[PDB]
Amino acid sequence: GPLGSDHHMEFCRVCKDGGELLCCDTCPSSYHIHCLNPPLPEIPNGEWLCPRCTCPALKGK
Ligand SMILES: [Zn+2]
Numbered sequence: 001g002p003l004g005s006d007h008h009m010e011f012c013r014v015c016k017d018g019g020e021l022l023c024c025d026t027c028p029s030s031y032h033i034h035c036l037n038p039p040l041p042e043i044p045n046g047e048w049l050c051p052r053c054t055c056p057a058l059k060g061k
């Protein structure tokens with residue numbers, strides 16, 4: 001809506017696509033299921049933390 005496109009990144013940091021944006025519940029990692037290192041076969045139905053929150057690193061990437 002007005003003054004509110006979405007939260008975090010309005011597009012994919014990787015592919016620049018802002019459709020099925022898979023963003024971390026914490027970090028502004030608005031990605032996709034194939035716009036990360038570990039590819040997901042489907043979109044997580046709920047809350048999903050970025051592919052960096054899965055480990056104590058990848059934050060300075
Ligand atoms: Zn993408």
Ligand SMILES: [Zn+2]
Nearest residue numbers: 024027050053
């Ligand atoms: Zn995260």
